[PDB]
Design an enzyme around this catalytic site. Structure first.
Site, PDB file in Angstrom:
ATOM      1  N   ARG A 129      -0.512   1.732  -6.569  1.00 41.21           N
ATOM      2  CA  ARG A 129      -0.967   2.728  -5.791  1.00 41.21           C
ATOM      3  C   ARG A 129      -1.463   4.018  -6.221  1.00 41.21           C
ATOM      4  O   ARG A 129      -2.497   4.609  -5.720  1.00 41.21           O
ATOM      5  CB  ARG A 129       0.000   3.166  -4.774  1.00 41.21           C
ATOM      6  CG  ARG A 129       0.593   2.208  -3.599  1.00 41.21           C
ATOM      7  CD  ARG A 129      -0.405   1.950  -2.933  1.00 41.21           C
ATOM      8  NE  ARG A 129       0.019   1.247  -1.746  1.00 41.21           N
ATOM      9  CZ  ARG A 129      -0.592   0.828  -0.383  1.00 41.21           C
ATOM     10  NH1 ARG A 129      -1.698   1.596  -0.342  1.00 41.21           N
ATOM     11  NH2 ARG A 129      -0.138   0.217   0.582  1.00 41.21           N
ATOM     12  N   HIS A 168      -3.769 -10.799  -3.690  1.00 38.52           N
ATOM     13  CA  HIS A 168      -3.154  -9.546  -3.143  1.00 38.52           C
ATOM     14  C   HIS A 168      -2.572  -9.763  -1.779  1.00 38.52           C
ATOM     15  O   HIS A 168      -3.176  -9.256  -0.799  1.00 38.52           O
ATOM     16  CB  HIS A 168      -4.025  -8.364  -3.212  1.00 38.52           C
ATOM     17  CG  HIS A 168      -3.284  -7.156  -3.441  1.00 38.52           C
ATOM     18  ND1 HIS A 168      -2.673  -6.695  -4.640  1.00 38.52           N
ATOM     19  CD2 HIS A 168      -3.025  -6.194  -2.739  1.00 38.52           C
ATOM     20  CE1 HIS A 168      -2.068  -5.496  -4.639  1.00 38.52           C
ATOM     21  NE2 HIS A 168      -2.221  -5.214  -3.066  1.00 38.52           N
ATOM     22  N   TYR A 196     -17.241  -7.556  10.992  1.00 40.97           N
ATOM     23  CA  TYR A 196     -18.808  -6.899  11.033  1.00 40.97           C
ATOM     24  C   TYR A 196     -19.540  -6.550   9.828  1.00 40.97           C
ATOM     25  O   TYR A 196     -20.808  -6.832   9.707  1.00 40.97           O
ATOM     26  CB  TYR A 196     -18.828  -5.795  11.978  1.00 40.97           C
ATOM     27  CG  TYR A 196     -18.183  -6.015  13.506  1.00 40.97           C
ATOM     28  CD1 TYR A 196     -17.198  -4.997  13.709  1.00 40.97           C
ATOM     29  CD2 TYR A 196     -18.768  -7.033  14.280  1.00 40.97           C
ATOM     30  CE1 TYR A 196     -16.436  -5.253  15.100  1.00 40.97           C
ATOM     31  CE2 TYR A 196     -18.129  -6.997  15.639  1.00 40.97           C
ATOM     32  CZ  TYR A 196     -16.899  -6.361  15.904  1.00 40.97           C
ATOM     33  OH  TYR A 196     -16.274  -6.210  17.133  1.00 40.97           O
TER      34      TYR A 196
END
Lengths: 721, 721
Positions: A261, A307, A352
C-alpha cells in the site's frame, strides 16, 4: 473479573466445546471466515474445542487490564479459557492447551501476533505455565497429479519428494491460507496430535519480551519501530520464544502491507498491484499501437492471476495511472470517463472505460522478455510473474507515489523526464556531482499542470538533499476587464472545491468585491474558473492575493522520498542517492540484456555458417532433399554440419532455398559479427557500458520526454483580509 | 418555495453554469460517476450548463409537493431550474431546455424514469410548456479497425455501413454506457445541437400519463405492476410522449434486475451470473475429472468476459452452488473452506478456495457444443455467450432458487432428481397426468438434509398445484440416557443459532429440565447437537415438542414457483406446468442436437466412401503420392473423388495409409449408416423423439440421481411451555 458462569454453556453458539479431564483438553482459536467451518469439522469433539473469531482482535498491548474486558472478543476469550485478565489464578483454566490456529500469510501472522500480545500482556501466568501454543500451518504444498500433499517443514518435504518415484513431476509451492484446505487436510496438518506441528510458546525473560513487544505494538515506540523496519525489512519471509515468534510474524505482516500500500520499489517506481496491472496488460497484448479493451478485461485477469484482492482495489489503481491529471506520464490510456481534477474519484465503471498500455509504458516493459528480470511464482504457483520491471528510466521520480502503512509513509512528487535524464547522465559521468550541482539539472518537481511552483530554490534544495519537506503551488490567471480568469490549478486541486470555498466567503460577507464565480471549463477551455469583480477599477491582484491565502488556489505539498531500495529495505533517500542507486540497478539490467542478445547473435551466426556451406553447393543440397527419405543425416555427413544447422536448412521452403543469396547471408554474418564484437567489449569494459546507458537515456528522453509544465516562480507572500 | 438566490452562484461547485438569453440556454442533468467529468468537457460553456447527480434520485411520485424539497437532490434541481415544486410559474425558469442525459443500459433507464417522474409530478407546467428533453444515447457502436463510430438510430447505421468500402469488417454492437466515451465522442453524439438526437418530451393527456406512472411507481399499484410485467415482460429491449418513454425505460430496467437477481430461466434453472460462472468454468477446461483451480481464476474470467459487476457478487454466487448444504446438486466442487450450515456466509476468500465443475454440471454443459443453444454478444461484443444452457434435466426444480426485485419474488425449493425424472417421463407419456397423479411421483421438495418434512399431503399438493404456499421441517433426534441428540437440522437452519435460542430460554428460566446444550459436531459427526436433561427420568419428547414450538428446530418455508418461461415472461407456475413447459424446451434442444450429429455423420460417411475407393487401389494411391508434386488433382482425376475426399486421403500418414483396413472402414460405414437411419426417423416421428428423451432421462437419473434425503413424516403439533 469476567462474567460468571456456573450453569449452562460457555459462549453458546460461538464456542463449540469439547466433552473431556480439562488438562487433556485443547482450545483452538481460529479466524472465522478463513477456517471457522472447517476447523469445527476437523477437530475431535472428545478433547478439542473451537472458538472462531471474526477478523483481527484489537491491539490490547497498551490497554489497561482494568479496561480490557470492554472489548467483547477479549471478554469472550477470558470466559472461554476461565481466567481473568491480570490475574495469575489459573485454577479455573478450562483447557490444558490454548492454541492459535492462523494462516501463514500476512493476515494470519498479524492475527497471531495480536493474540500473543493479548496473552503476554493480560494472561502472562498462562504463558509462563506453558499453556499457550501455536498450531503451525504447513510450510509447503506439493502437487503430484491430482494429489495434494502438505509439508510442515523442510524434513517432511524432503521425505515426500524422495518417496515418489515414477512419472509425474512434483510442483512445490509456498503455503498461504488454511482456507484452502478441506476438513480432512486441516485435521491431518494442524489438529491431529499424531501428525500436527504444535509449538509451545515460552515467555522467557518477561522484561525483554515486553521490551520487544513494546517496539512492535506501542504508540510511543513509533520511532523505534520505523528504525527496526529500516534495518530488518529485507528479512521479511517443540518450543519457541514468544518474542522471536511475534517479531518475525509482525515483521512479515508489516513489510507486506508497506510494500502493498505504501512504498514502491526504487527499480521501477511501482507497488505490486501496479506492476501486476502493467504486466497483465502486456500479456493481454495491449500494446499502445493497437485497440484498447474494456478495463474489466484487465481487472479480471489481474484478479484471476496476479492480485486476487478485490476488483475495486485493482481498478482504482488502474484509473490513477490512466488520469493525465494524476500521472505525469500515464502508464495507461483509452477512451472513457476516467474522471477529472474536479473529483478524481468520480469515474465510470470498469465495464465501460477502455484501457491499453501507453507508449511510455514501453520504458518499463520492452526489455522484459530479454533475460533482464527475476521471476517468482504468482499467488497460487500456476504462473510466473516479474519481481521488478526492467525500467529504462527512473520512473520512481517521474510519476512519484503516495501511501502509508503501519506508520510508514511516502510522498514522492512527479518530475520531468528530460531534467531527470540530464541529472542521471551527470551522475553516471561523475558520481561526485554535488546535491547543489544536481539541482541545476533537476530544479524541482514537475506536475501535470501549468500552475506555478513558488517555493524558493534553497527550500527546494533542502527537500532534495534530505528527502523531506514541503513545496507550494499557485493557480495561474490573467485579468480581463473586471474578471479574474484562472486557467491552471495546483496539482490535485479541485476547481469545484475552489468555487465552493470562494462562494462560502461571499456568503460570509468576506468578499464584497467579488460578485460572481463561474466554472467556464469546457472542451475549448480545459480549466477556466472566472471570478467576477464589481468593476474594472478593482485591484485584482489584491483579491487574488487574499484568495491564495484562504483557498486551495495556493496549496502546500508534503514530500517524503521513502521507498524500498535494491537491498529490500525501506529508506528515505535524497534525489542524488535515488539516482545513484537506480544507475547501479540499470547497469545490472543492461548487462543481462546484452548477455541475452549475445547468446542469440551467436546462435544465429552458427546457423548462417551452415547456410553458407549449403549455399556454396546448393544443387547437391536440393538433390539430397529431393531424393532422400531422411535428408538430415545425409546433409550432416556430406557437408559436415550439425543437427541444428541441418534442421535450419530443411526448415526453409524449397522455394526459399532457391532464393537463398550468398550476398544476403554474408551481409547478415558481417552485421551480426560487428554487433557481437561491440557487445563483448561493452560487457568487458565498465566505461563503455556507461556510454551505452547514456546514449540509450538520451534517445529515450528524446522519444518519450516533454517540456516542463510547472514553471518555478518567485511570488510575494499571500496577504489575507 | 425553494431557497432564494439573488446574489452569487447557484449551487457553487456542483452546477457548472453557462454564460448565455436564457431561452437559448440548455441544462444537462447527468449521472456523476458515469459521465460527470466528460459532460463538462463535452459541453459548450456559452449556452450549456451541466448538473451532475450522484446515483439515482429518490422516487418522488408519491411524495407530496409540500414535502419534496426535503430531499437535497430535488432541492438542488429546483434551484438549478428556478422553479418551485407544485407551481406553474415559469417566470424564473433559468434554461430553455432541461435535458436528461443518461446511459442506454438498465441503470440509465431507471435514472431517466425517476427524473421524468419528478418533473411530471412536481413540475408539470415545465413539461407541458415543452421544456423537458431527453438526450438520446447512441443505439449502436461500430468498430472499424482502430476507428469507433456511433449511430443514434437505424438510418445512421445504414449510412455508416454503406460508405465504408474496402478491407476491414465492421463490428456492430449495442451501445451501453456514456462512460465509455471520451469528451469529443460525447459532444458529437449527445450535446452538439448540429449532431445530437435531443427528444422533446410531451405530457399529452396528464390524466392518462399519471395513470401510467401510478402503475410504474406507486406502492398501491403493486398488483397492477406485477400483472404488467407478466404480460409485457418479454418486450424488454422530434417528440415523444413521456408516458411511452418511461413505460419502456422502466420495463427495461425492471426486467433486467428481475432476471439478474430474482427469477431464473425455466430452461436451465439459472440466472445470468450463475450461467456465466458455469459457462466460464467450462471454457477454462474445469471438467470434474481434472484438477480444480483457485476460485479467483474463475471469478477473474467471469468479471473480465461475461459479468463485470463486482468480484463479490460473482464469488458469492459460486459459493452457493458449491455448498452441499445449500445446493441439492452442487454445480461446483473443490477443496477449501466453503463455509457451513452454522453460517453459510462465512467462508474463505477466493484466493484460497479451489473450484472445478461437478460431474452433475455435465447435464447442463455436455451438449453446449452441439448446435443446441442460442448465442449472443457478451457485454462488450468481443465474445459470444449462450443465452440458455441445453439442460438434460429440469435443474430449475432440482436446485431451486430464491430472490426478489421490484416486488417480484421467487422461492423454489430443491427436489429429488429421480422423483422429478419419473414425473417428467409420466408427463411425456401422458400430458393429461393430473396434478394429484403427479404428486405420487413427486411427493414434496427434497432438501440437502435428512431432517423431516411434516407438512400433510394435501397441503403439499396445494403448493404444487398453485405454485405457492408453505411447508415445514423438523430436526431429527434420538434419545440416549438423559440426552437429546440431534443429528439433522432443517434446511438452512444454523446449529449455532439453535444453541443460542435454547441457551436464551435457559437463562430466561424457561427450560428448567435442560441443564446444558453442547455442539458436538466434528468429522465423525457432521451434525451433533446435544441437549442435556436433569436425569434419565425426564420425558424428552415433551422437551423436544416445546423446542419445536419455540426454536428453529422446527422451521417454515415459503414457496413461490416464479420464473421466466420459454416465452420470456415472468409467471408463477404449477409443478405440472413447469415440467410440461420444460419438456417442450427439451424436445427443441434434442431435435437440434440430432440435426447437428446427422450433418457430422453424413460428412464422415462421405469421407469413408473416398477412403474405400482409395483402399481398393491402395498401390496406385501410394504411387501417386510418392511421385507427384501435386497429388491432389491426380487422385481426384483418377479415382473420381472430390477435394474433401482427396485431402482426407492425403491427411493420413503414409504409415497409416498402409495400415488402412477395408474391414475397419466398412464397419464404421455400417455403424454410421445405422446411426443416421435412427436419427432421421427420430427427426421425422415425434413419438420416437419422445422415446429417445425418455431413455436419456432414465440413464441420467441412474448416473447422477440419488435417494430421497428428507423423509416425509406426519407429526403431532408442537406444544409450548
Amino acid at each position: 473479573e469476567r462474567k460468571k458462569i456456573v450453569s449452562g454453556p460457555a459462549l453458546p453458539g460461538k464456542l463449540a466445546d469439547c466433552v473431556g479431564t480439562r488438562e487433556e483438553s485443547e482450545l483452538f482459536i481460529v479466524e472465522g471466515d478463513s477456517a471457522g467451518g472447517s476447523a469445527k469439522q476437523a477437530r475431535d469433539k472428545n478433547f478439542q474445542a473451537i472458538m472462531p473469531i471474526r477478523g483481527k482482535i484489537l491491539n490490547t498491548w497498551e490497554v489497561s487490564s482494568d479496561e480490557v474486558l470492554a472489548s467483547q472478543e477479549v471478554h469472550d476469550i477470558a470466559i472461554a479459557i476461565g481466567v481473568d485478565p491480570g490475574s495469575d489464578d489459573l485454577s479455573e483454566l478450562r483447557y490444558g492447551k490454548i492454541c492459535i490456529l492462523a494462516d501463514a500469510d500476512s493476515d494470519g501472522l498479524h492475527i497471531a501476533t495480536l493474540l500473543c500480545a493479548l496473552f503476554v500482556k493480560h494472561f502472562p501466568a498462562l504463558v509462563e505455565e506453558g499453556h499457550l501454543y501455536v498450531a503451525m500451518p504447513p510450510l509447503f504444498r506439493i502437487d503430484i497429479g491430482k494429489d495434494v500433499h502438505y509439508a510442515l517443514d523442510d524434513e517432511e518435504l524432503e521425505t515426500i519428494l524422495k518417496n515418489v518415484k515414477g512419472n509425474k513431476n512434483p510442483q512445490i509451492t509456498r503455503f498461504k491460507g488454511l482456507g484452502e484446505m478441506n476438513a480432512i487436510q486441516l485435521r491431518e496438518t494442524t489438529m491431529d496430535p499424531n501428525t500436527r506441528r504444535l509449538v509451545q510458546l515460552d515467555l522467557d525473560d518477561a522484561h525483554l519480551t515486553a521490551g520487544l513487544l513494546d517496539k512492535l505494538l506501542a504508540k510511543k515506540r513509533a520511532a523505534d519501530r520505523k528504525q527496526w523496519l529500516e534495518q530488518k525489512g529485507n528479512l521479511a519471509d517443540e518450543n519457541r520464544s514468544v518474542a522471536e515468534f511475534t517479531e518475525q510474524a509482525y515483521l512479515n505482516y508489516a513489510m507486506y502491507v508497506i510494500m502493498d500500500r505504501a512504498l514502491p520499489h526504487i527499480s521501477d517506481g511501482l507497488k505490486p498491484v501496479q506492476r501486476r496491472i502493467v504486466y497483465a496488460m502486456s500479456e493481454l497484448g495491449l500494446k499502445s499501437s493497437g485497440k484498447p479493451k474494456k478495463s474489466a478485461r484487465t481487472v479480471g485477469d489481474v484478479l484471476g492471476k496476479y492480485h486476487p484482492h478485490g476488483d475495486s482495489a485493482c481498478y482504482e489503481a488502474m484509473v490513477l495511472m490512466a488520469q493525465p491529471f494524476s500521472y505525469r506520464y500515464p502508464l495507461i490510456e483509452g477512451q472513457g470517463n476516467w474522471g477529472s481534477p474536479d473529483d478524481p474519484k468520480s469515474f465510470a465503471a470498469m465495464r465501460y472505460t477502455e484501457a491499453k498500455l501507453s507508449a511510455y509504458s514501453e520504458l518499463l516493459l520492452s526489455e522484459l522478455g530479454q533475460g533482464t528480470s527475476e521471476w517468482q511464482d504468482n499467488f497460487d504457483g500456476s504462473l510466473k510473474e516479474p519481481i521488478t520491471l526492467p525500467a529504462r528510466v527512473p520512473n520512481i521520480l517521474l510519476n512519484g507515489t503516495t501511501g502509508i502503512a503501519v506508520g510508514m509513509a511516502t510522498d514522492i512528487p512527479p518530475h520531468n523526464l528530460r531534467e531527470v535524464v540530464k541529472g542521471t547522465i551527470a551522475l553516471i559521468r561523475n558520481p561526485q556531482t554535488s546535491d547543489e550541482k544536481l539541482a541545476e539539472y533537476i530544479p524541482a518537481p514537475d506536475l501535470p499542470t501549468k500552475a506555478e511552483i513558488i517555493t524558493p530554490p534553497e527550500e527546494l534544495l533542502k527537500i532534495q538533499t534530505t528527502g523531506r519537506g514541503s513545496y507550494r503551488m499557485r493557480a495561474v490567471y490573467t485579468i480581463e476587464k473586471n474578471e479574474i480568469v484562472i486557467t491552471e490549478l495546483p496539482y490535485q486541486v479541485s476547481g469545484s472545491k475552489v468555487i465552493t470555498q470562494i462562494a462560502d466567503q461571499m456568503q460570509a460577507k468576506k468578499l464584497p468585491l467579488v460578485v460572481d464565480v463561474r466554472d467556464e471549463s469546457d472542451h475549448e477551455n480545459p480549466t477556466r474558473l472566472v471570478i467576477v469583480l464589481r468593476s474594472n477599477r478593482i485591484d485584482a491582484e489584491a483579491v487574488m492575493s487574499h484568495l491564495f491565502a484562504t483557498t486551495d488556489l495556493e496549496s502546500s505539498y508534503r514530500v517524503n522520498l521513502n521507498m524500498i531500495g535494491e537491498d529490500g529495505r525501506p529508506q528515505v533517500k535524497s534525489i542524488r542517492r535515488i539516482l545513484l542507486e537506480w544507475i547501479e540497478i540499470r547497469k545490472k539490467t543492461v548487462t543481462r540484456r546484452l548477455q541475452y542478445h549475445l547468446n542469440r547473435i551467436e546462435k544465429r551466426l552458427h546457423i548462417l555458417a551452415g547456410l553458407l556451406i549449403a549455399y556454396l553447393d546448393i544443387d547437391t543440397v536440393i538433390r539430397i532433399i529431393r531424393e532422400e527419405d531422411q535428408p538430415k543425416p545425409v546433409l550432416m555427413e556430406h557437408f559436415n554440419i550439425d543437427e541444428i544447422q541441418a534442421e535450419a536448412i530443411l526448415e526453409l521452403k524449397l522455394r526459399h532455398l532457391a532464393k537463398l543469396e550468398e550476398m544476403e547471408i554474408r551481409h547478415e554474418q558481417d552485421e551480426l559479427s560487428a554487433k557481437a564484437a561491440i557487445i563483448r567489449e561493452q560487457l568487458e569494459n565498465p566505461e563503455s557500458l556507461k556510454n551505452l546507458i547514456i546514449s540509450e537515456l538520451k534517445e529515450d528522453a528524446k522519444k518519450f520526454g516533454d517540456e516542463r509544465r510547472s514553471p518555478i516562480v518567485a511570488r510575494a507572500e499571500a496577504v489575507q483580509i
